[PDB]
Amino acid sequence: EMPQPKTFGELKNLPLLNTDKPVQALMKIADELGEIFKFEAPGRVTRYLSSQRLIKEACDESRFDKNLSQALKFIRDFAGDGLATSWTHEKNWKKAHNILLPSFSQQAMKGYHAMMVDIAVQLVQKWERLNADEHIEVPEDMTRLTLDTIGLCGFNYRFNSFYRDQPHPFITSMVRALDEAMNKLQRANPDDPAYDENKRQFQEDIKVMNDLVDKIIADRKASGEQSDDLLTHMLNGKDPETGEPLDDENIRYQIITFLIAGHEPTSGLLSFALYFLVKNPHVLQKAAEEAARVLVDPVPSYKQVKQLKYVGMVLNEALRLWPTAPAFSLYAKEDTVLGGEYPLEKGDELMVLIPQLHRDKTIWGDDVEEFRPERFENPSAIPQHAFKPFGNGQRACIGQQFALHEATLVLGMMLKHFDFEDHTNYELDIKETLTLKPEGFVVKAKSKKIPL
Numbered sequence: 538e539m540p541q542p543k544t545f546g547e548l549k550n551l552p553l554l555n556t557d558k559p560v561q562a563l564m565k566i567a568d569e570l571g572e573i574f575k576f577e578a579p580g581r582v583t584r585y586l587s588s589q590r591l592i593k594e595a596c597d598e599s600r601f602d603k604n605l606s607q608a609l610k611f612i613r614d615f616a617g618d619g620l621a622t623s624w625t626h627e628k629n630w631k632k633a634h635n636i637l638l639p640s641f642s643q644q645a646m647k648g649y650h651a652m653m654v655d656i657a658v659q660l661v662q663k664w665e666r667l668n669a670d671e672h673i674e675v676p677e678d679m680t681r682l683t684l685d686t687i688g689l690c691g692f693n694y695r696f697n698s699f700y701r702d703q704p705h706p707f708i709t710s711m712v713r714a715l716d717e718a719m720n721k722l723q724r725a726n727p728d729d730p731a732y733d734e735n736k737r738q739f740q741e742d743i744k745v746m747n748d749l750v751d752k753i754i755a756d757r758k759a760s761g762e763q764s765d766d767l768l769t770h771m772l773n774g775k776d777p778e779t780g781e782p783l784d785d786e787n788i789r790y791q792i793i794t795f796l797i798a799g800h801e802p803t804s805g806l807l808s809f810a811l812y813f814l815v816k817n818p819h820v821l822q823k824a825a826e827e828a829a830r831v832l833v834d835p836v837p838s839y840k841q842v843k844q845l846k847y848v849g850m851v852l853n854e855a856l857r858l859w860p861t862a863p864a865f866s867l868y869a870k871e872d873t874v875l876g877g878e879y880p881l882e883k884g885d886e887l888m889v890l891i892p893q894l895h896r897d898k899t900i901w902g903d904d905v906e907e908f909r910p911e912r913f914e915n916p917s918a919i920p921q922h923a924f925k926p927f928g929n930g931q932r933a934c935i936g937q938q939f940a941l942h943e944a945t946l947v948l949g950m951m952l953k954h955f956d957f958e959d960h961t962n963y964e965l966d967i968k969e970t971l972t973l974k975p976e977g978f979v980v981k982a983k984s985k986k987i988p989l
């Protein structure tokens with residue numbers, strides 16, 4: 538009874554994801570098959586959920602817990618039992634959860650703001666300093682910004698991305714390791730000697746990341762500056778339940794986890810937000826008007842960022858259309874029936890296909906493809922589990938407020954400081970990595986010539 542997309546013999550559905558854009562492939566499948574489809578691969582089955590109707594059940598934490606998708610399982614080879622790749626039942630998940638949640642308290646957020654502004658100003662300055670007719674490589678610069686922000690705010694580490702015309706080596710290795718991790722989904726015989734080089738490159742890339750992590754830790758140890766940041770909590774915070782701090786190994790995984798998680802989807806969000814803004818000039822103008830009205834100081838204060846309501850709406854609407862961490866996986870904690878209709882056995886896996894959730898016309902109306910920030914004029918109007926860019930429940934994104942604050946600040950500053958032109962009439966082309974990004978999205982920015 539459950540729809541299932543086309544199969545490939547013994548490979549079952551797995552070749553469907555042998556594409557550069559698997560999330561978009563799954564969205565198309567969802568478009569065809571509806572709110573739920575079974576997806577089989579050799580030795581694996583999951584069910585992709587796309588309707589709020591079913592996802593609200595899936596989001597019942599008494600019935601389902603976070604599952605490590607194959608992607609996360611393979612990413613776990615270097616993210617280990619960091620927060621994102623740990624099972625809820627692993628001691629280190631709840632420990633690190635409890636230890637690191639304070640890093641995203643309101644007070645923490647205020648504390649990050651200055652460094653977020655530091656990086657944002659670097660972005661603005663970069664764009665201010667472009668010559669006539671030069672253009673902005675949007676995902677690239679958003680990723681420079683987000684990486685630097687998480688590095689600086691989180692770890693008091695400067696990736697100095699705006700000093701580089703190429704991504705920081707960490708990124709290069711992180712991108713290749715993520716990609717290798719996700720390529721393993723397709724690999725029938727992962728121990729085939731043909732993948733020895735992939736294994737070597739994987740370890741080399743993991744070593745690059747870990748070397749940077751070791752440097753972040755050593756620099757913090759050696760530091761004479763007082764820090765009270767995410768790393769501080771990693772190195773010193775004690776879990777109230779266990780009384781225990783994170784052990785060294787987990788700290789390292791958390792650093793890797795947060796460097797990755799703390800920058801990748803946010804960069805996508807910013808990129809998509811700017812994409813949608815330049816595609817929707819009335820929206821852009823409204824957002825710009827808000828930025829101009831609110832950001833009355835040379836650098837935004839924390840409170841001003843919080844007053845960028847419409848910018849927040851823009852970001853939420855971008856997350857609605859292109860949630861940059863576009864899926865998460867769940868497993869049935871016990872036998873349960875989904876939707877009154879689909880019996881699941883304990884351990885059965887679900888995938889929540891967030892972009893498709895966000896296109897559930899029964900929630901959003903028929904105009905789901907339109908970019909309408911006003912959908913979020915009162916976010917509380919959105920039904921529960923209808924809008925899930927940050928995942929669910931206690932396994933939701935710990936960094937959501939950081940992401941949104943950063944993105945609101947940055948977008949606000951961008952909108953305050955520049956007019957943007959979609960000079961190429963850019964054709965959305967969504968590159969799928971760990972996140973989604975509008976690949977090749979370029980704009981031209983005309984400074985409003987507002988000093989910092």
Ligand code: HEM
Nearest residue numbers: 620621798799802803806862865927928932934935936940
């Ligand atoms: C707009 C940007 C972001 C989006 C869309 C996003 C999305 C998500 C989603 C969907 C999950 C759940 C994944 C799952 O259940 O498998 C998640 C978890 C997580 N995110 Fe984010 N995220 C963003 C930014 C960030 C930031 C800025 C940080 C850290 C500073 C971060 C750190 C994490 C961590 C550590 C987890 C795992 C939480 C846990 O399981 O304990 N993310 N994110």
Ligand SMILES: O=C(CCCCn1ccnc1)N[C@@H](Cc1ccccc1)C(=O)O
Nearest residue numbers: 554559560606608719862863864865971
């Ligand atoms: O589920 C995840 C992993 C989601 C990670 C989201 N994310 C980002 C940051 N934090 C969490 N991919 C999806 C889509 C997919 C399928 C095959 C190959 C690659 C991708 C799936 O396997 O169905």
